[PDB]
Amino acid sequence: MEAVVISGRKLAQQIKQEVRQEVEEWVASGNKRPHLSVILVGENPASHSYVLNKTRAAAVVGINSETIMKPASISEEELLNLINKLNNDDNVDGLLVQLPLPEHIDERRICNAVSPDKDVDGFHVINVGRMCLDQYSMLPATPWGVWEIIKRTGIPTLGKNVVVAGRSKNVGMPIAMLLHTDGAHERPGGDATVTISHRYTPKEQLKKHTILADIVISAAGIPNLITADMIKEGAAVIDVGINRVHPKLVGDVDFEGVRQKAGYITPVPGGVGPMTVAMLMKNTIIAAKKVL
Amino acid sequence: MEAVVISGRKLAQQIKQEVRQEVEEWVASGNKRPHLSVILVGENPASHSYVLNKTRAAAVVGINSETIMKPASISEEELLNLINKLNNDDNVDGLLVQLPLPEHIDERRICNAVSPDKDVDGFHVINVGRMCLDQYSMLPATPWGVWEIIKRTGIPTLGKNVVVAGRSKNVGMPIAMLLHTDGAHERPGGDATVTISHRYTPKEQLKKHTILADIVISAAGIPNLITADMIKEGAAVIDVGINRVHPKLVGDVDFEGVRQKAGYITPVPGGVGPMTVAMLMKNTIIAAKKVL
Ligand SMILES: NC(=O)c1ccc[n+]([C@@H]2O[C@H](COP(=O)([O-])OP(=O)(O)OC[C@H]3O[C@@H](n4cnc5c(N)ncnc54)[C@H](O)[C@@H]3O)[C@@H](O)[C@H]2O)c1
Ligand SMILES: NC(=O)c1ccc[n+]([C@@H]2O[C@H](COP(=O)([O-])OP(=O)(O)OC[C@H]3O[C@@H](n4cnc5c(N)ncnc54)[C@H](O)[C@@H]3O)[C@@H](O)[C@H]2O)c1
Ligand SMILES: Nc1nc(N)c(NC(=O)Nc2ccc(C(=O)N[C@@H](CCC(=O)O)C(=O)O)cc2)c(=O)[nH]1
Ligand SMILES: Nc1nc(N)c(NC(=O)Nc2ccc(C(=O)N[C@@H](CCC(=O)O)C(=O)O)cc2)c(=O)[nH]1
């Protein structure tokens, strides 16, 4: 079978065009231009590259952005101080702290310091609790991106079988939460039958579940975790992995094998990555309009 | 095969004996006896019967209890007023509001009014968020009960297949959250591979998942949902359903059929019900000692 290769870049262009229109109508009428603040700690090159993609996307949709660079040596107290100032500044609509942080800093304490109304990553414990109760909330950008790839392509979820490989609190768990929950709730879900797997799932048991799946979502960070023999013909396969191997970028899916069996497949790069960035822009216009 | 019929009543007696010892050592030394307050609204007979089981269990383990009876006609404002007084009373260690409430009352607002330190049901949004991040929290009594049945019987979960029938925010979702999460986190999980199913799961797809399961947990409220042909030989089957049929009580599992195929089975009544009550007593001694 010849899989349709879904272009995340094209879909993200569509979403960015919608955000720009909303922003330019808001500013034309004399309202404040929206503003996003990013705190970046240390010198990790991939972190610097992701934050650049985020601030360029803001530029192109009419959102002002600032990147605050701090050394890896900063204390927890200093970083909390800086977050309190941004929380109290009425020009600042969204605030996020790029992860990961240095070992001496408690990431959970930092995520809980960001005001929940400006928490455009959806990482504050109140935003996590609201999301797990299917209430209105700021949704994490990568999992919302995965959701939009599925919905805008027209792939059905109600009554369908979904397997998620990965249980991380920022990616795998929220994807599983969105896809299994009730379509009639405040924040609608996808009404799918969902399996979550992880590092202690034996490979034989992962395979027995993925062969039943209409949609397989891999967010494990393991090259070639998903291969053609594990997929039922015509399934949708979404690759959320980003793996640097020796010096190259690859996903969790053996693309070249699975493209011969799936009905739909996302590439790495150029799939979920651009969709993460686009959904962040949507969260920022939502924070700026104060409707949540 | 002859299934071992697990006695929830015997297991709950063991847990209540442990709680009584802890309470009587605490009071012998001159500390305040623990105290649990229950608010019961309206005249639902099953609600009145569950609350009686709760206050009798408190009596037998040395915990003082009060049941506050209010008419179904009470306003949201009056009920919030009463919760504020109990929250501010230092004699009161645990506070819970029996559900369901009348249609004119917003249950979510009421659950979020209970102080999170006295929230022995685990229903406040902060307790829900902490639980979904695998942090120390007050766990909901029915899902903790299900967990204790599995652990005290000696049934393994790490790398095993689990199916949960039901996605309710007070029962099915928390059971799924506890069983799939990491054993090394602050609040350890069970490291199982978990499928969640619900009202839009077709019966044919429920069956294709349950035949792979080492543990099947039914929390749907549908008589005879689980039948012998859906179970692999030697599996553990936990019945969390409580269904009044015409005038009789039954679970979600066809007990008489599944007892011939499973390795372990819980009865209704006398299974998960007594374990819900016992784990509530454990949450109350935890709230009274102020260690969380
Ligand atoms: N926009 C994007 O595309 C985007 C954004 C963030 C992260 N990611 C990628 O997602 C992947 C994981 O991201 P994360 O934030 O969850 O990091 P993480 O490393 O915490 O995730 C690892 C998760 O995968 C699970 N896992 C490990 N081995 C497994 C196996 N053999 N089978 C099944 N599951 C297994 C773990 O138990 C854990 O939950 C990485 O490749 C990362 O680069 C992509
Ligand atoms: N201690 C105890 O034993 C205890 C405590 C509370 C509730 N319960 C029982 O648990 C059952 C459900 O409790 P609840 O609080 O979740 O109430 P609920 O009625 O909200 O739960 C129904 C859930 O089951 C799902 N469901 C409905 N039909 C289904 C089907 N055909 N296949 C799979 N799933 C389906 C729904 O989508 C929903 O998530 C009831 O029988 C109730 O009496 C037992
Ligand atoms: N706070 C916070 N920290 C985090 N670490 C994340 N994750 C978080 O930024 N991920 C991410 C991953 C990839 C890209 C990206 O632009 N990917 C492109 C280009 C790949 C590359 O340059 O290597 C692609 O996949 O096509 C953007 C963001 C987040 O959303 N919030
Ligand atoms: N706030 C709040 N509201 C709620 N509705 C619940 N659920 C909530 O009390 N369930 C429950 C169910 C059954 C029994 C019980 O004692 N069952 C016995 C006897 C059955 C009967 O008398 O009908 C058994 O199954 O063996 C106790 C509590 C809760 O935990 N907290």
Q: What is the CATH number of the domain that holds B71?
A: 3.40.50.10860
Q: How far apart are CA A79 and CA A84, in angstroms?
A: 9
Residues A259, A149, single domain; the answer is yes
B87 and B201 belong to one structural domain: no
A266 and A145 both lie in a single domain: yes
CA distance B122 to B143: 10
Tell me the two tokens of residue A65.
Answer: 């952005």
Strands B243-245 and B248-250, by their bridges, are: antiparallel
Among candidate residues B93, B119, B121, B254, the one labeled active-site is B121
* Cα gap A3→A58, rounded to integer Å: 32
Look at phi and psi of residue B154 and say left if phi exceeds 0, alpha if psi is from -120 to 50, else beta: left
Q: Token pair for residue B23?
A: 């309470």
Smallest CA separation from ligand 3 atom 2, residue:
A98
Instruction: Give the C-alpha separation, A9 to A271, whole Å.
Output: 7
Our answer on whether the CB atom of B53 is closer than 6 Å to any ligand 4 atom is yes
Task: Clarify whether residues B166 and B257 are in a common domain.
Answer: yes
Say which CATH number the domain at A167 has: 3.40.50.720
B124 found inside a domain:
no
One domain, residues A160 and A51: no
Q: What are phi and psi of B201, to 5 degrees?
A: -80, 120
Instruction: Evaluate whether residue B234 is within a structural domain.
Output: yes
Single out the residue of A218, A198, A156 nearest to residue B191, CA to CA. A198
Residue A241 lies in domain = 2-6+140-273
**Residue A56 neighbours by CB under 8 Å, 6+ apart:** none
* Chosen from B198, B204, B212 to mutate, greatest number of chain A CBs within 10 A: B198
B55 and B102, same domain (yes or no):
yes
Q: Does residue A130 form part of some domain?
A: no
Q: Which ligand is nearest the CA of B239, by number?
A: 2
Asked if B166 and B53 sit in the same domain, the reply is: no
Specify the number of domains making up chain B. 2
- Would you call A109 helix, strand, or coil by DSSP? helix
Resolution in A: 1.9
Question: Can you say whether residue A204 is alpha, beta or left, with left for phi > 0 and alpha for psi between -120 and 50 degrees?
Answer: alpha
Ligand 3, pocket-test mutation among A11, A50, A142, most atoms within 8 A of CB = A50
DSSP run (H or E) holding B76: helix B76-88
DSSP code of A112? T
Residue type, A170: N
Residue B22 within a domain: no
A16, amino acid identity? K
Q: What is the dihedral of CA B280, B286, B287, B289, to 10 degrees?
A: 150
**What residue type is A59 in one-letter code?**
A
**Do B260 and B172 fall within a single domain?**
yes
- Verify that B158 and B269 share a domain, yes or no: yes
Is residue A281 within 8 A of residue A57, CB to CB? The reply is yes
In a domain, B278, yes or no: no
What DSSP string describes A132-196? HTT-S----HHHHHHHHHHHHHT---TT-EEEEE---TTTHHHHHHHHHS-TTSSS-----EEEE
Beta strands in B94-214 (DSSP E): 94-97, 161-165, 193-197
Query: CA A106, CA B49: separation in Å to the nearest integer?
Result: 46
CA B151 to chain centroid, in Å, comes to 15
Q: Which of A262, A256, A178, A163 shows the shortest CA–CA distance to A215? A: A163
Q: Which DSSP helix (H) or strand (E) runs through B55?
A: helix B45-60
Residue B168 gets the label, from left (phi > 0), alpha (psi -120 to 50) or beta, of beta
Tell me, yes or no, whether A84 lies in a domain: yes
- Give kind and range of the element (H or E) at residue A94: strand A94-97
Q: How would you classify the pairing of strands B4-5 and B264-265?
A: parallel
CA A158 to the chain's CA centroid: 22
Asked if A134's CB is within 8 angstroms of B129's CB, the reply is no
Report CA-CA distances (Å) from A124 to A107, A129, A135, A175, B71: 11, 9, 15, 17, 38
B163/B264 same-domain check: yes
The reply to whether A225 falls in a domain is yes
Q: Could you give the CA distance from residue A235 to residue A224 in angstroms, rounded to a whole number?
A: 17
- Rounded to 5, what percent of chain B is helix, strand, coil? 40, 15, 40
Residue A34 in domain = yes
Regarding whether A153 and A111 lie in a shared domain, the answer is: no
Please name which of A158, A180, A134 lies closest in space to residue B176, comparing C-alpha atoms: A180
Please tell me whether residues B101 and B146 are part of one structural domain.
Answer: no
